[PDB]
């Protein structure tokens, strides 16, 4: 999974 992807 991408850490910089949408976390909201």
């Amino acid at each position: 999974p991408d850490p910089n992807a949408n976390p909201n």
Partner: antibody, heavy 122, light 107 residues
Framework: QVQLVESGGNVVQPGRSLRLSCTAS????????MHWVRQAPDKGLEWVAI????????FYADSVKGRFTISRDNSKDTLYLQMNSLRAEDTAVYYC???????????????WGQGTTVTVSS | DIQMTQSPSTLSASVGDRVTITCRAS??????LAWYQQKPGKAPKLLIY???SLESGVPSRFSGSGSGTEFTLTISGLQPDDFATYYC????????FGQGTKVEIKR
């Protein structure tokens, strides 16, 4: 507006544990990911950890992986950082930051708290 | 890890001057670069995102340019409130910061 208040910073002996809190107000805390960032002269600005809005996806920096645990309680609008096996190099000012509401392929943080100070020494 | 380095470390300037801070990345981060401003004893504050996009509430004297590995922050007409330390940050792969650039009063 958006307000982040850190607490829990204290003087701790090496190898012990400390728990930091970030109490949020002014925004819907349950909808945003949150970051922990630390600052010290030997470290500059150093990202520590991020947690997704629901508390599932968590990523850590190598410098703290295996020792620090990030968690949150959305019913209290409070973010936590559990620090275990603390080292002298962990001494820094610890900030909590909100992930921004800018829609794009990559995301970062916008609003920071005032910070709480952690000093690790014997 | 993508390394961020800023130039210069200390910039000496006067009110009204047009000054430029440079940020460089160890590898390409596309345009995923943010600039923050921090005053002593205070928290960082977001100024520019996506290299060139001004944050709402930030005066228009702050402008940004750059892509890939080289980026710049330019303050046109320095004001007394602008004397502080400015950090760049890449958010392409995790989050790493520059060492910081302190803008001081020239005398």
């Amino acid at each position: 507006q958006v307000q982040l208040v850190e607490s829990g910073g204290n003087v701790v002996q090496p190898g012990r544990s400390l728990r930091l809190s970030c109490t949020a107000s002014g925004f819907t805390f349950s909808s945003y990911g949150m970051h922990w960032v630390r600052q010290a002269p030997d470290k500059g600005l150093e990202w520590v950890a991020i947690i997704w809005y629901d508390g599932g996806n968590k990523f850590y920096a190598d410098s703290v992986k295996g020792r620090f645990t990030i968690s949150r309680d959305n019913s209290k609008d409070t973010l936590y950082l559990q620090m275990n096996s603390l080292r002298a190099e962990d001494t820094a000012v610890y900030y909590c930051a909100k992930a921004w509401y800018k829609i794009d392929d990559k995301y970062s943080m916008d609003v920071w708290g005032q910070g709480t100070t952690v000093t690790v020494s014997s | 890890d993508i390394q961020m380095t800023q130039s210069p470390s200390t910039l000496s300037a006067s009110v009204g001057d047009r000054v430029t801070i440079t940020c460089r990345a160890s590898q390409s981060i596309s345009s995923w670069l943010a600039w923050y401003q921090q005053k002593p004893g205070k928290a960082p504050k977001l100024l520019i995102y996506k290299a060139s996009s001004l944050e709402s509430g930030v005066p228009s004297r702050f402008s940004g340019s750059g892509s890939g590995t080289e980026f710049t922050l330019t303050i046109s007409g320095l004001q007394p409130d602008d004397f502080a330390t400015y950090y760049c940050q890449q958010y392409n792969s995790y989050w790493t910061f520059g060492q910081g650039t302190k803008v001081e009063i020239k005398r």
